[PDB]
Every structure is written in structure tokens, then in C-alpha cells.
Amino acid sequence: GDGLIRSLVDGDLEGFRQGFESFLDQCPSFLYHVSAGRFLPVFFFSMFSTAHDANILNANERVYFRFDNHGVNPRNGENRNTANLKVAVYRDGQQVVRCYSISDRPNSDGLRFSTRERNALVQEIRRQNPNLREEDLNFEQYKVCMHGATVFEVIREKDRQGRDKFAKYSASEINLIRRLLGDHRLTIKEIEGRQLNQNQLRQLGRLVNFAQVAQGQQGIDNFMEMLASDRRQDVRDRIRREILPYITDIYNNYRQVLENNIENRNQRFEGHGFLLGFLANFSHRYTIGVDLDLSPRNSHVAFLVRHQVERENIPIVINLATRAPPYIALNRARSHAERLHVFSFIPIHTESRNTVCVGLNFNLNLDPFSVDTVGLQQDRFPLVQRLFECLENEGIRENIRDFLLHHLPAEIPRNAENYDRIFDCITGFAFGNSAFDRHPLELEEEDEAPITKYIFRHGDEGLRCLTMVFHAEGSDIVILHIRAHDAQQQGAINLQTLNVNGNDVHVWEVSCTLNNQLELDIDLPNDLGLYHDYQNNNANNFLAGDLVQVPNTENVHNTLNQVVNDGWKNIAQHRGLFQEISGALMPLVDTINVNSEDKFRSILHGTFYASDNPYKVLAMYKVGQTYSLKRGQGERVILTRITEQRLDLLLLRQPRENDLDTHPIGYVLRLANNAEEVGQQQNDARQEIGRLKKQHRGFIPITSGNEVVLFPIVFNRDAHEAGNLILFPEGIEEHVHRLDR
Amino acid sequence: PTQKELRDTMSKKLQEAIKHPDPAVVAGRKSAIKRWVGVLQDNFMEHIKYFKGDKLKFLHNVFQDEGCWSGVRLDNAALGQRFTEEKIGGIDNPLRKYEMACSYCVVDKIHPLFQKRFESYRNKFPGKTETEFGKYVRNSLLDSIKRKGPVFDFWIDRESGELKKYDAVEGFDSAVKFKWSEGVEYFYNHLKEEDKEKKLTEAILALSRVQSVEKDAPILDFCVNKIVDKDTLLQKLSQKDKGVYSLFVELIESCFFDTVHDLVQCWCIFSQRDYELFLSSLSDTMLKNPELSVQARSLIMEFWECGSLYQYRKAAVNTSNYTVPTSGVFAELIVNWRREDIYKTDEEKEIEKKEILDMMSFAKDCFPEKFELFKKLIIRDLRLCGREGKRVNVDYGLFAEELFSELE
């Protein structure tokens, strides 16, 4: 590479485009937040304010900035926390002043540099060059924007005539005029056309001011070398002694500039943009990977620094808290770290058993950060076992809820518009985990009991409730309900089919409800009494429906042992795997109701999780992005369209000393509601695989081998027999994809 | 809560049973409880997670027994017999006896305890030979218990059901691969007297890695303290990349302080970064286990006042690029000095003072033109970073300024 700020300052737009393209691969979730407050502007500010300290730019290459805050909306007159970033660079002895405008919006009002911004800029230039001739200065105005998330453009505006090379007003100026006048709904032509009073012009001149960034007392040239290590103690010391003190100092130094001329700024997203910028200044020199989680109720960022393909380097997890104690922020960082294998791709790019956690609150005067180390290991959650253990032990409900919620794909938002998606994923995941559990129940009193699983089909064909029954032979029975917000039927499930000696056998119920706020609530377990008393007391209270026994699925576990290992490139082994899964689901197709691709994917996800092999299974895994370009016409417009590529299911082994090939297996899943819809679904799945084969750098850090297995899978809802339930390619070779290193 | 938090709630509850006259023993045995339960990862917490009431009173009676201890470490043989008794002190045994017989190598009881579990599990079942069904039930049972660790699949043959017998060399190599502390000790005793020194060296090298886990450190302590020629071992360790460093930090964080003292005195090498990290590790551990303050502090002063390490201590206090390599060490020492959560003699506080002051005097003399910045940096580490045992909303930087005043 060559450097993002370096390529920008030098005017090498194609070098900046290719460089920013590589950073977008390093931070796959960057684009989701470019339109959230000042996330994008602060990102670029950080990159510029820390470049002198990183020796990217010389002291000769002066950098001047200004935050062009948008202000009130012309449509509703409400405050906005968005802004534009105006940055210019001047090297003494040069006649070129390169001016840059950064904003989320592609053509936001005031994005162009204003005449007053030019006067405020040249004012700062002469604090060191008092007798500089401004007529000899040639201004090169550029624009950089990304919006949607799907588009990223770099534009070099064409040369313009005098007094037309600069716009009349910036975003902040337009906001002040509206505030100085009465109307907030004044259009630009209105504002530009009205003659302004001399006092109003003075307030406009006092509003636009530029500031200069310079090198500090602490150089950060080798700050990423300090983090590209395998020693947790080293990485811990470097973050606590050098790295974070610098970031805290720079953010607190420019603290007043952030809060000026802005109301209700998003401190979460701005603080995260500042951290990403610091890292982006080293993106061209190191293989960095950033996993950002900025969804609601989440403020985490996990990154891993490497020189090339080191497999034991220490990840770093930072939680940013706007208004929280430092210990509280560290707690949140530790909680994310313990579940990092479910959430993040970072435990895939490193095999380290520890992670450095950091809780950060920029607002605190004392104790702004705290650092500690947390173990990093993949956990196997026994769903059926914890269900039985949660009847007499409190707190397991939290872990059971966390198990189901954390495995939800991060792509699916947890709002009212995706309620059915979330419900389909939770029920399908719970089914696959419980229906495909081969182990018996480890009882509390030094004993074990085999578990025969059942699933109940409600009389209402269109009811959103998954009900299963787990019978521990010789012990208690647990009825599990995963209900929607409106599926609150309390009729009893008939357990007459269960062959139960009376014993001390009790019937328990654990009910779960996904509410309208998208929170999964697990009620307190209830003892419904002894089995015989349960059947007699509910004689006229039995829910209409049928209790279908779950078939034995032990051969699926043995088959996955061969498929995940030596037979991962064998199409027939994969064909037999899904034929057996089909053989198990066919007696349950009507009771399970695989009515959507989410349900289909989550059933398989829970199946591969419960089985010892694969070691790791991920749903909706982002492999990477594709960048298509468009060039336009001096006026140099470079447009980049970004399209994401995701794998419905990715199955991975664990890297071992003898075998570092994780044997990556990817499945593209589709659902066919009718037998006529089958051919279109298969073709669509095959087309997606062809596009996945265009991705390479996304599959390279996931394995030490040079091939990936990709298969198209289609669920045939209207299948007559089990042989056609899950449709697998018959082979009439396109599943093995060689990787280009 | 988090899994770490559940571990400490069980660690702190099990620490109530520890009662000894010497404060140093009580606090060293408390560290062994945290090692037994697990700190950064689960150890025996897997078996005692749900233990409540009389179940905890059983473990309370075990750890309060002097016979289950050997100084500050647990007597594995004593624990093995206690954890396989039907009841002690009138309290029933809440642990799974077969799993305990496997973990502590009670080989006389492993097979009869497994057969009890096998019979009660078989009797819960309704095309396959009765012999083949028993092989299936044995495989299903062993695979279930194997979820908690490979030790529970180690002693029972899956084809015949008989108790497996192992050569000491094989069991020793398996216990290291399993990171099985108790198993490493059992097979060492059965090793040939000529194979003992060679086997311990292999284990120390293998587990002295950057990717080490807390479970490796008990094995390392046992193997190091039984090596006869620590000199020859230190030579082979130096050839391995960061082998000396990895062995050092593993015993430090696990509070194996007596094992490190004897190691640092022998050959009174390692890099400068290794040197600085030993101090940082000790200082952190000092805060995570404040009752071991003296022991950790004494180890710092040995690393610091080692005359052969003169070239390392000077660079440690060399202020460069707005940082000094030991700012944290100084800061963490100050935090210990102002610790009001644990009672301490005023004499202790005082020795703790002159302890720090002597180190600041070394930095003042070594680099006086940089000593003014040194000061700003030290108070920086004390106001920018929050640490364990550091009280909230109080300026620990003012305390450092107090010491600087006394210094001049």
C-alpha cells in the first residue's frame, strides 16, 4: 500500500480509492454507520489529526480542518447531529492548496467549500506565513462521500472561474442565516438571493473558523507493531501505558471543537469513528481486522493486528461508554469477549486463548479506561441439559436466553419489522440443538438417563409456537414452549404416548415468549406435578394436536465426522449427510413447519452446533465485498459501488498443530414452497455460488489450505418422500473452489 | 453474571474454610483455591457450579483439613480419597465420585465406580446383542461424561469395559497433553528414576509457550521444583523462543512465587522487554491478590536489585517518547500502598513507601534531565488508567506528588 492520508494529500485519488477499498475489507461493518451522526466526519478527522504523530505527513505539510455542522432540517426544523468535514492541506513553498469535503450525503447543502471558509483557511495559513500572496495560491477542491453503505465516491471538481470556484455558504452558514432570520424552511436560492445585513455578515464571519493539527509529544509510528504480538502481557501493557493514553489525550485535546455548534451529538458513534481512524492510518502497512458491533444496545469494537498470517496474535476488545462508569464499560467488554466465538470473526483469524479487554469512557476526568485480560475459548452450550438444570437452579435461564439470542444473525435487525425472522431463527435454532442432541441427561444424583425427544403440532396450522417435550427415562419430563407474543395458549400437552413408570416422575414446563420489544422472556419453571396426576387433572384440558416422536439422529453425528474431516471434498458424503437429515425431518415436516429460509437455516445451524463436528458453524457469515467502478467526466469522478457477499452457513474445523486446514464448508440455502418453484431456487443458489467464487481474500484468513467447498441446498416443502425433502446436487465438479494466494 | 464472576463467587465462598495462623499461608492457600476453581477459565467449577448449602459444607470441611494441604498447595492424594468417600463429617459427598476418581488417579476405585454408573444407566433402556448393547451403552455413557474432559475417557476401555493400565511414560505424556495437573504427578512417581529428569524437561519446554493457559502453570511448578539440575534446564529453555519468559509469567500470575524466587536466584538470559514484563506482571498480580502483596513486592525488588540486571533496570526508567517502561509498575505499587480494603500495619505502609522512593531515586539519578517528565508520566498512568483495588473518584495522582515532594 501507500497510505490513505498520504494518497489523499498527494492528490492520488486512485491510490486513495484502492487504499480505502482495502480498509473496507479490514472493517466489513464500516458502511453500516457512515450516515449515523458524525461517524464518518470524525473518522477522517482522526486520520488527519494523528497523521503527523505517525510520521505519515511532515511538519511542512500543514493540515487545517473545520466541522461544517448541518444544523436544523429545512423540512421539520429539528436539530441534526450530522456534519460535513472540511480539511485542507498546505505545504510551504507550494502553490497548491488541496481542499477536501467529507460528508455522508453525496450532495448535501454546503458541502462545497465556501468563500468565507477560504478566507478562514488562508487566515490560518498565514499564522506561519504572514506575507503570503493569496493570488498565487491554486485551490484544488475535492469531495469524498459514502451513503446508501452501497456507494463510495471520490470527486475532483473541475476548475471554476473566479468567485465561482467557491460556494457562497457552507452548511453551518445556511443554518445561521435561517436562525438569524425567522424561517427554517428557506431554500438555498432564497438564502443566496436575500441581501444580508452588515451585522448578520459579522456573525457569519465569526462562525467560520479553521484550526490546525500538528504533531504531539508522543509519536505513534510503531503503535501497531506493539499490538502485532502473541504475548498478552505485552499487548496489555502497550494499550494501558502508551496507546490509550495517546488516544485519550488527542480526543480530549480537540474536545471543545467537537461540542461546538452542535446539539445532541452521538458520542457513541463519534467515539468509535475516532478509534477506527486511528487504526485506518495503519491499514496500508498491516493486516488489521476490525469487527464493529454498533447495533442498538451494543457499543463494542474488536480488532486484531498482524504483519502477515500470524495465527496466535492477541485480539483487543474495546467497549465505548458515553455515560457509564469505567468498570461498567469493562464489564461490557468482558461479556463480549467471552462470547466472541459466536459474535465475531476475530476468533477465526487467530487461535489465541486470551483477549485484551478495554472499557473506555472519554467523558470521565479520572479513570477514562480500564484494561484486563479474559480467556478466549469456544463454548459448547448443552441446551437440553441446561433446560433440565434450570428447573432447580436459577440463572441458567439467562444463559439459555443468551444462547438463543446471541446466535441470531447480526444482519437481521431486532425490530418489529423482522419479528417473524427473529422468531423463525430462534425456534429453528432451538429445534436443531434439541432434536439432534445424542447425549443423555446427566442427573444431579450421580446418574444418567436417556432422553427421548418429542415435538408437538398444534391444532392451529398457523400458530407461531414451537413446543417440544424432553423425557428423561426414569426421571422428570420437561415441556418447552417457545411462543410468539400472541401464542399464549395454556392448554395442556397430552403425555399419554410417553411410556412412563410413575416413580417420582414430575412434569415441568419452561415457557418462552418473544415480546413486541423483541426480548425473549423465560418465565420461572413450573412443576406441573407427578405424571399420573398431570394426566388426570388435565383430562379435559388437552390441547388439540399430535405429539410426534423425534427420530434417532445419532448417525448424523457419525456422518458429520466423516464429512467435516476426510470427506469434505466428497460430494457423495455431503449427499448422504443431507439424505440422513432429510430422513430425520420427514416425519416432522408438518410439525416443524419449515415455512421460511430463516427457519431452514436455523434448523441446520442448530444441528451443526450440537454435533461435535463441525467445531464451528456460523450463519450469514460475511465473506467480503465486491467493488464495481464507474468513471466519469477537470471533472474527475470516481464512483465505487459496494455489494456484500455472505455465506448462509459456514462450517469450520479447529486449527490443530498437525492440521491447520480448517476444511471450510459453505452452504447456500434456499426454500422452495412448491415443486414448480424448485428449479428457480436451485438456479438462484447456483448463481450465488458463482459469485462467492469471485471472493478470495475473504476465505484466505479462515484456513491454511487453498480450497473451499461450496454446495447449493434447497428445501423442498412439497416433497413426497424424504429422498426429495432437501435437494442436493446430483453431479451431472463445481463445489471445490481453489483459493488464490 | 459472567462466567468469571460466578467463578469468583465460588472462589471467595470456598476461601472461607481456609484457616491458619500465618497470614502468608492463608493467603497462599487462597490462591490455590482460585487455581482449583479456575480464574480465567473453568477448572473444578464445572463440578461445583450448582453446589449450595450442605454441598458447599462438604467442600468447606475438605479444604479446612490440614491433611489436604502441603504448605500452600493442595495434597492431591488426600483430596483423591476425600472426594471418593461416601460421606465425611456426617455430610454426604455431593461430587460425582467416578469423575473424581479419574481426576485424582484413584485407580482402585475408578472401575467399580464406573460400573455403578454403567449399570444404573443401562437399566433405563427397553435387534442388537446384549454384549453389543452393553458396548453401545458404555460408549454413550463415556461420551457423555467426556464432555467435561478427556480424563473421564482415559481409564476405561470402550471395547471390554476393563480398567486401562498405562505405562508411566505414556500416562505422563498424556497428562501433559491433557493439561492434567493431578495426572502429571501420579505418573511421575511411577516413572523410572532415570527417566524422571528427562521427562520433566520435555514437559517444561512444551508448556513454556506464549499460548500458555493458567492450567499449564501448576504442571510447570511441579516439574520445575523436581528438576535436579535447574542449570542444565535453563540452558535448553533459553534456546526456545521466549521459553524462559513464558515459564516466568505463567508462575507469576498463578502466584507460584516460591517457585520463581528459586528460579531467579539460580543464574542471578531474557530480554529487556522480558525484564520489563516480569515487573508488570508481578505488579498486576499484586493487585489481583492483595494479600500476597509482600511476596510479590519482594519478587519485584529481586528483579530490580539484581546487580547482573543493571543494564535492564536503567532502560526501564529511561523516559522516552512520552512514556517510561515502568510507569505502570510504579503506579500499581502506589495503589497497593493506599489500600484501605484490607487491614495493614502502618509499618507495612511505611516499608511500602521507602520501597517506591528508592526506585524513584534510581530514576532521578540515572536520568536527571528526563526526571521532570518522568514525574508527569507517572501521575499520568495513575489518572488515566483504572485498576483493581483503586478507589473510585479519588485522585491517586496527588499521592505520587506527595512522594515526589519527600524525594526532593
Residue numbers in the entry:
A (entry chain B): 4 to 151, 161 to 645, 649 to 747, 750 to 758
B (entry chain A): 2 to 127, 133 to 274, 288 to 427
Task: Provide passages from the article that reported this PDB entry.
Cytoplasmic incompatibility (CI) results when Wolbachia bacteria-infected male insects mate with uninfected females, leading to embryonic lethality. CI is caused by linked pairs of Wolbachia genes called CI factors (CifA and CifB). Protein-binding experiments and expression of cif genes in yeast have shown that CifA binds its cognate CifB specifically and rescues CifB-induced yeast growth defects. CidBwMel consists of a region, which is predicted to contain two PD-(D/E)XK (pseudo) nuclease domains (residue 1-751; hereafter CidBwMelND1-ND2, ND: nuclease domain) and a C-terminal deubiquitylase (DUB) domain.
Of note, the ND1-ND2 region of CidBwPip_I(b/2) (a CidBwMel ortholog from the Wolbachia strain wPip Tunis line, hereafter CidBwPip(Tunis)ND1-ND2) expressed well in E. coli and shares a sequence identity of 71% with CidBwMelND1-ND2. We successfully determined a crystal structure of CidBwPip(Tunis)ND1-ND2 in complex with CidAwPip(Tunis) (specifically CidAwPip_I(γ/2)32). The structure of CidBwPip(Tunis)ND1-ND2 is very similar to the model for CidBwMelND1-ND2. (The residues at the interface are well resolved in CidAwPip(Tunis)-CidBwPip(Tunis)ND1-ND2 with good electron density). Substituting the CidAwPip(Tunis) residues at its CidB-binding interface with the corresponding ones from CidAwMel abolished its ability to bind CidBwPip(Tunis)ND1-ND2 and neutralize the CidBwPip(Tunis)-induced growth defect in yeast. Thus, the structure of the CidAwPip(Tunis)-CidBwPip(Tunis)ND1-ND2 complex accurately captures the CidA-CidB interaction mode and is biologically relevant. Among the positions that show divergence, residues 118, 125, 149, 150, 341, 342, 399, and 400 of CidAwPip and residues 242, 243, 253, 254, 257, 451, 452, 460, 461, and 462 of CidBwPip map to the binding interface of the two proteins. These variations create distinct interaction surfaces for each of the four known CidAwPip_I variants. Similarly, each of the four CidBwPip_I variants has a unique combination of residues at the CidA-binding interface. His-tagged CidA variants I(α/1), I(γ/1), I(β/2), and I(γ/2) cannot pull down GST-tagged CidB variants I(b/2), I(b/1), I(a/2), and I(a/1), respectively, which supports the hypothesis that natural sequence variations affect binding interactions between CidAwPip and CidBwPip from different strains.
